[PDB]
Amino acid sequence: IKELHVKTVKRGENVTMECSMSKVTNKNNLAWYRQSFGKVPQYFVRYYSSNSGYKFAEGFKDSRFSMTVNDQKFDLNIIGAREDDGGEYFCGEVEGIIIKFTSGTRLQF
């Protein structure tokens, strides 16, 4: 069972959390989930064919977050990491009705 990557970061730093397009089957079904400590995880951003390649959840108002999406990567970025950015982020692909998470990162300070 795949271990989360642990990412340690200082307030104000820029971070990238990685998910690999390798062995992803259906990009259209790929997304990141974000879980703040002590809360249930939430759908956060999906792959989305367009000029950006990705589309944040409608409830999300934070321009510090972005993605680097291409052939190899579906990587989540943050500029100016802030205390409450910390948590666990999981990249999963849905198939049928099962979300299979292929990787995640614990972001901590």
Contacts with a copy of itself by CB under 8 A lie at 1-4, 6, 28-29, 31, 33, 36, 38-43, 46, 90, 92, 94, 97-104, 106
Nearer to a copy of itself among residue 15 and residue 60 (C-beta) = 60
> Shortest gap between Cβ of 13 and a copy of itself (angstroms)?
22
In a 13 Å sphere around the CA of 27, the CA atoms on its Cβ side amount to 17
Give the whole-angstrom CA distance, residue 33 versus residue 95. 16
Nearer to a copy of itself among residue 54 and residue 103 (C-beta) = 103
First-to-last alpha carbon distance for the chain, in angstroms, is: 25
> Shortest gap between Cβ of 87 and a copy of itself (angstroms)?
11
| Sheet containing 74-78, strands listed edge to edge, beginning at the edge strand earlier in sequence | 15-17, 74-78, 65-69
Nearer to a copy of itself among residue 6 and residue 23 (C-beta) = 6
